[PDB]
Amino acid sequence: EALTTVKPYCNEIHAQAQLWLKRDPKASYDAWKKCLPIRGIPSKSELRHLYLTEKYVWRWKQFLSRRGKRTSPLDLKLGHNNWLRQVLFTPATQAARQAACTIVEALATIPSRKQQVLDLLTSYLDELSIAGECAAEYLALYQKLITSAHWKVYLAARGVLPYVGNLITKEIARLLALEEATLSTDLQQGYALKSLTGLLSSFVEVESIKRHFKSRLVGTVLNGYLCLRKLVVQRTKLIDETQDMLLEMLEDMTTG
């Protein structure tokens, strides 16, 4: 990242794949590189000046694209369904999942892109139950991208704790419903629940979210713990570990 000769704009994407795949001269590589400022090799007035010139030059260019002939850059706002979800959880081969994980990890370097990358990966959370072990890569990517505290706090501020809690409760209810009816054996039972509870523990371990988000999560933890304890036949080691973690969260959050 420290070797590039141009600096990509924070909130826009200038590359346009749809025109590039059609051999459009305006969307070529040289044309793209010509649209980016070179990487440059201070008092309050100077920073104010940079702010105003940047803002109003951007507005002028927006005019010139709106009325004139210069093309308009795409806005950095990622869609919630693409090929990325299909590739990231494919059961055909594991190397494809690993390669896609590496690609998306590399796609998130400047924080503006990390926004959308983290948001899309968080949106993909409900796929843990469907593709239990096949998500082992994606989890390892997700837990890798939020290893810093402020990203965890940002994700908490967007309401992921209720999301993960709802997913945990829904799949616990599915476990109870399955246990009531049939007697089959599944060797991947409890993987999604174990992963989700580990994720919740990671989110809560930081002090600010633990202090702030205790009042809305005690009910979910308590109900999940009781329903897990009610299990008597469809019990695996992962379910015991999940019960232990849930009890630990219950004990921790009930102090003060």
Added chain:
Amino acid sequence: EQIAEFKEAFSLFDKDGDGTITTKELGTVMRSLGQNPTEAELQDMINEVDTIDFPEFLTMMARKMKDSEEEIREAFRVFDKDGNGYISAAELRHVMTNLGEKLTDEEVDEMIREADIDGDGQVNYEEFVQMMT
């Protein structure tokens, strides 16, 4: 209701519980409520005020969803380096080179001439005001 959400975000980003945060996470706070700043935006905001507590945090939010005529005049003065009120292609070129971003002379002439209504090949304050509205 928006003061409540701003307090919610500030408290959630409050690290030590004292109602005060650090400025290295200053960007992430309004970066989380849905607005997207740039690095120059961040540096201008931190320089204007500055460790931030709730009151000046509210003052910062007070001037974001709003453009004020004072800002347009300040931009016009920054562009008009010689201060004569007429933005020449040379001054535009200087400001774009200070930005580090590069154009040809033909393109600069083109954007200048498409910003003129009086046909004189020279933009002024009234044209700037009608442009930025």
Added chain:
Amino acid sequence: SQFLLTRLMSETERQSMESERADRSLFVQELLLSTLVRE
């Protein structure tokens, strides 16, 4: 080893090549992100 046909870079060009590799990488990242934009 006696075959003749079997037996058929500076530092400035090396820095140039490294910078070009970084630029191409950035272009490919932008191209890949451009296909994930919502329609």
